[PDB]
């Protein structure tokens, strides 16, 4: 199956004193592997997966250097954006950045991305072709002009199609015991009665990896979405994920309803009944 490496960065300004709170996290697929937190004591990029601990002090020195530079860019940005938007020094503001690369089953480059938001709104993003920019408003258009003049897209494209893919492969290989393992969902059904005429069936998927999954209900072999509730996929806290989907049914008619589960760890999609 497909894989990705993504980095996520948040800076939140602190108006009254000092620099922003900066938090950086790195992922391979749905596995966090590194973090930097400006409030933490170490002031180093820190490992969050055993397979990254393989990398030497030179790696850690390099990543720490770069991540501090990312923090300084964000600090400057928060000031620039306050100016662009004619805002006061009184309020706290947020910048968010995400970039990374997708590869397919053959581990070859599929897609790259680099996007930026200010106070939770799109600001500027690299287009799919990795050659041009989407600027949401006139402030971001001024940024676009600057980045065109400085050939920023060209630098990013080289990274996204090159280093990003190359190091994704490296991590996938080094972390193969977990990163290349799929954990099929463990499934079961629960039943509840709300009245003597209405029941709830809930189809559970637990302990699965990666997070991508599909859970659906059928009634007499036909798709059922009415009277269903599907919760957001949630982290278990041990690296795996959980989800459920429920349906409301007439008491006594539970037999018509079947839950269907699709996941990369199941060679055959799975069916459950009450």
């Amino acid at each position: 199956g497909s894989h990705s490496m993504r980095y996520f960065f948040t800076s939140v300004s602190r108006p009254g004193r000092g620099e922003p709170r900066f938090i950086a996290v790195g992922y391979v697929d749905d596995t966090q592997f590194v973090r930097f937190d400006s409030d933490a004591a170490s002031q180093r990029m820190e490992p969050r997966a055993p397979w990254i601990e393989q990398e030497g002090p030179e790696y850690w020195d390099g990543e720490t250097r770069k991540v501090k530079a990312h923090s300084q860019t964000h600090r400057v940005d928060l000031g620039t954006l306050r100016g662009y938007y004619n805002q006061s020094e009184a309020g706290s503001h947020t910048v968010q950045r995400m970039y990374g690369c997708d590869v397919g089953s053959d581990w070859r480059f599929l897609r790259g991305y680099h996007q930026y938001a200010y106070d939770g709104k799109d600001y500027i993003a690299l287009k799919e072709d990795l050659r041009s920019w989407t600027a949401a408003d006139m402030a971001a258009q001024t940024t676009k002009h600057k980045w065109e003049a400085a050939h920023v897209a060209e630098q990013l494209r080289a990274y996204l199609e090159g280093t990003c893919v190359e190091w994704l492969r490296r991590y996938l290989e080094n972390g193969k015991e977990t990163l290349q393992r799929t954990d099929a969902p463990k499934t079961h059904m629960t039943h509840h009665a709300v009245s003597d005429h209405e029941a709830t069936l809930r189809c559970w998927a637990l302990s699965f990896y990666p997070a991508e999954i599909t859970l659906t209900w059928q009634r007499d072999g036909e798709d059922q979405t009415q009277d269903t509730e599907l919760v957001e996929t949630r982290p278990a806290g041990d690296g795996t994920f959980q989800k459920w989907v429920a349906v409301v049914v007439p008491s006594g008619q539970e037999q018509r309803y079947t839950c269907h589960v699709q996941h990369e760890g199941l060679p055959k999609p799975l069916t459950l009944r009450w």
């Binding site: 980095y7 790195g26 990543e63 770069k66 991540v67 530079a69 990312h70 860019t73 400057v76 940005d77 620039t80 954006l81 662009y84 950045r97 970039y99 930026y116 600001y123 500027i124 971001a140 940024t143 600057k146 980045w147 400085a150 920023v152 630098q155 990013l156 990274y159 280093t163 990003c164 190091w167």
Partner: peptide, 9 residues
């Protein structure tokens, strides 16, 4: 591996 350089807005 983080991107080498990060341009300011």
């Amino acid at each position: 591996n983080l991107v080498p350089m990060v341009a300011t807005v």
